[PDB]
Design a protein around this ligand. Sequence first.
Ligand SMILES: *C(=O)[C@@H](NC(=O)[C@H](N)c1ccccc1)[C@H]1NC(C(=O)O)=C(C)CS1
Ligand SMILES: *C(=O)[C@@H](NC(=O)[C@H](N)c1ccccc1)[C@H]1NC(C(=O)O)=C(C)CS1
Lengths: 504, 504
Amino acid sequence: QQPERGKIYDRNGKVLAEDVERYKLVAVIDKKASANSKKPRHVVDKKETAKKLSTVIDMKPEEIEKRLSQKKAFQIEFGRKGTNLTYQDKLKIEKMNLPGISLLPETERFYPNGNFASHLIGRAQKNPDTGELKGALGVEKIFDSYLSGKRGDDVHLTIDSNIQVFVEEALDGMVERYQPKDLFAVVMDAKTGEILAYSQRPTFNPETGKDFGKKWANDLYQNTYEPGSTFKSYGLAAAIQEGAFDPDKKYKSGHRDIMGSRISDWNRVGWGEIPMSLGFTYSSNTLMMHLQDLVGADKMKSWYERFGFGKSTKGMFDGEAPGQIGWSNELQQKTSSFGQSTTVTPVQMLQAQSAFFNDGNMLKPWFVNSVENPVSKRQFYKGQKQIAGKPITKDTAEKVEKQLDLVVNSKKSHAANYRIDGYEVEGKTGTAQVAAPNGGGYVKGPNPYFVSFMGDAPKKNPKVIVYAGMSLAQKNDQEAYELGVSKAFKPIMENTLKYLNVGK
Amino acid sequence: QQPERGKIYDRNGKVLAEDVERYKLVAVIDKKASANSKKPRHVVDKKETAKKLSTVIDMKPEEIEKRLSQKKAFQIEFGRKGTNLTYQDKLKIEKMNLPGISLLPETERFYPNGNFASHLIGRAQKNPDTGELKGALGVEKIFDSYLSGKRGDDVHLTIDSNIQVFVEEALDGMVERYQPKDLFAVVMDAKTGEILAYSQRPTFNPETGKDFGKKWANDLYQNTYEPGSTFKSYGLAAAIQEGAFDPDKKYKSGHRDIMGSRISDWNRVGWGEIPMSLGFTYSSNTLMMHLQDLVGADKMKSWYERFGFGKSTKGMFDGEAPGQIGWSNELQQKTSSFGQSTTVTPVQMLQAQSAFFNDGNMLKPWFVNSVENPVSKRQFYKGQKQIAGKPITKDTAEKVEKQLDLVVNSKKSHAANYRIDGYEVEGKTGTAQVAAPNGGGYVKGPNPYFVSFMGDAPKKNPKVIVYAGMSLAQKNDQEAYELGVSKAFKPIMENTLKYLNVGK
Ligand SMILES: *C(=O)[C@@H](NC(=O)[C@H](N)c1ccccc1)[C@H]1NC(C(=O)O)=C(C)CS1
Ligand SMILES: *C(=O)[C@@H](NC(=O)[C@H](N)c1ccccc1)[C@H]1NC(C(=O)O)=C(C)CS1
């Protein structure tokens, strides 16, 4: 028969996916089966058999009888409700001692946590003819040649199921409240790059197949976003190191005219001549345009490239999107400074953000801990911390971190809804416009925003980074604009900090 | 945003897959949208709107009214029923001039023939956030990087849509009649290895997604079979070339005792001492075991290996199965001589069978004619005839072909139901036992057979090879044993021979 497909484990050894034995119900209905035998080998009483079978399977007795009455057939099955039956279901049916009724063992792929990190783990599909399982998405697909067999190798993830629960629960909350078109959250260990939790909405249920195929793209590695103002931190880091950002230097706020278009601070008028530090706390768009002018267009492109953007991070997911740095003209360049036109993956954002908490060294994020075989003990692969690049100095990092502290904790902050009681939080907010897939423009509406937060806690020396974004709320779009992802970040961040024994 | 994904063509240039424009229905329901305008820009009459809208979309107005009556919402959409709407559907709705009602264009992937070579062409899935299309099976998947974009490249197949119809129609016939667990048919140009038509059952509908994912395996390249007595031709080819098969020399029919198991000819008793040609006409199992004894176990293993079995043919389908030559012991070796224990892909059988019609040269089967871009005119790839290997001599091929002629047309033939009026037909039959997917035995039952025919016509100098197999008929399983796949081979072969202008 088939070799046992390897298991997918979480960082603490909990099974995320495995092979189990289930059972399919089979009924011989042709009288010829009992010709030679003393006790009947087929269904004599269709009515009683159907009545009694409906006590285990989710079928009405008239339907079982209908299927039981098909002609020119030796055996019948009962569709979706005849299979994936439990060992308990088997025993119930066998005690019934129904003639012609049997249960046939079948291998199924079992996901013990159901809808749980689904767009990461993936789904294995079965070929009924041979029972052969073949991964169709995520880890099951990426690592299909190892997982398959004699027994396949196991794949151990960096995911912590305890932190994953916090994420899953938070995302359910977001959907209920905001019904967004797309949504994701990811928790990364701030010192190693390990992905401790990831999920997205909408997603699917690996165990039932529900909604599988409706959205093939994994948001972390394969989808791309105009990030919005969370992108401002890398412009700021560049400005700091080049000697263009002085936190106390004043600058002319208000607007800039770019190729005949008005790019304004979010209040249209600005605040007059204000210190550069305050403008970042306000998320002043003119600040970033001004800083770009200081550093230089050519230099700013290299800066964004040296932060990893526009190229794949080379993770172990299939089809990793590279994004692109929008630099074709001044309008694209100026809008890229606050995170429009340029497109990114969430994994790129995690990689760049990590520079500020590792003396300027970007960490390559990673989610595969081990591929190894449990019978032979052969280890094929082992994940590890890896520096993707050191684009800034330690001094620049600390100076970036000070403005991220002020974004949340300045008296003039517009991000106090992201604060958590007992825990010092910092990060950067984003409210970004999202391109219409057909239409060549931005999606229109009262608040047609991709709202996001790139946060970390405890501030200065964080244990985890939390990045969460929500695209185009369809319910409560006013609150989505006012609160961003704060109703996701707080329950994720707080519960993780508690589980990791960080002190309040 | 997205480039146009390239097209999939048939050998004569008919579109099998392309990008089209469809439509999604959008209803603004907030009064603020019509606040500034004189005529309402939102849905004022929800009841009338819902009643009228249900004349186009598959939704009952009681449900439409509920969705139109959601709070904290500006716009609403209508799920799966609100999208993939046609231009005809669009004009109808716009004729209603319902307030707040709009149509938004979306790119969809269109398969003009619906359920048509579906397990070869495949299906591309859409990521709603960006509209980006991604092949999930078949040619759409294999050639996704070429089809994707700026405009994607085209993929031209060797399939002839005209012959495909014959196959599609015959396979529908078999299902209705026999309800098999598995079924496939394939037409190959006998002199080039081109795949002119292929299909399987059950399958899916690329255009709607119906039943997609239910069975991932492509029967031609990815599924494996104990072929049964169609495998005998390669044993015969070996014996001929080794000097062990003489058509007129007699042999002891009846049975052989192999490792304590009695393996008999299909009528249990045999026919006494009969000539070897007649035994092949009868599909005598003991003949093949006797021939194996003559040639030698080791030599016979090289023979099946040199006919290509046990290794992938190195085609351009993903995850091509290798099969295996079942040789662990005498019982496995001896049953392999009549096509059990050993497993194969249909593509291997086609490759080996072509030897008999090309002076012994095996042809590599192939189905991709061209990958090229219609804007730049760059050709990335062009398919061609290729000799997989010449395992036998011209003389041995001719001698095999003579026994395949007698299999169908001897006065003592047991295969006359495969004859076609006006056309000289030849081939080899198979009635094989099928291994239990979970368990250690063969599927049990009245006629638990994988029945097949490996045929070609016109005989001796055929224009096409037709291979068809049917696994485990659930309806009319007795007739399946008596007629094999003849109710599929005859209409496929006859309609193709006529379409190809072969004279009756
Ligand atoms: C950064 O993301 C920046 N976004 C914008 O300038 C867009 N165009 C915008 C969206 C809504 C209202 C005004 C402008 C903004 N940064 C933030 C933030 O930090 O969340 C906000 C709220 C507006 S300015
Ligand atoms: C070849 O396929 C061969 N098959 C068998 O010997 C199996 N074990 C069998 C199945 C049904 C009945 C008897 C034996 C047979 N070849 C053929 C044929 O050419 O189709 C038949 C019908 C029986 S012997």
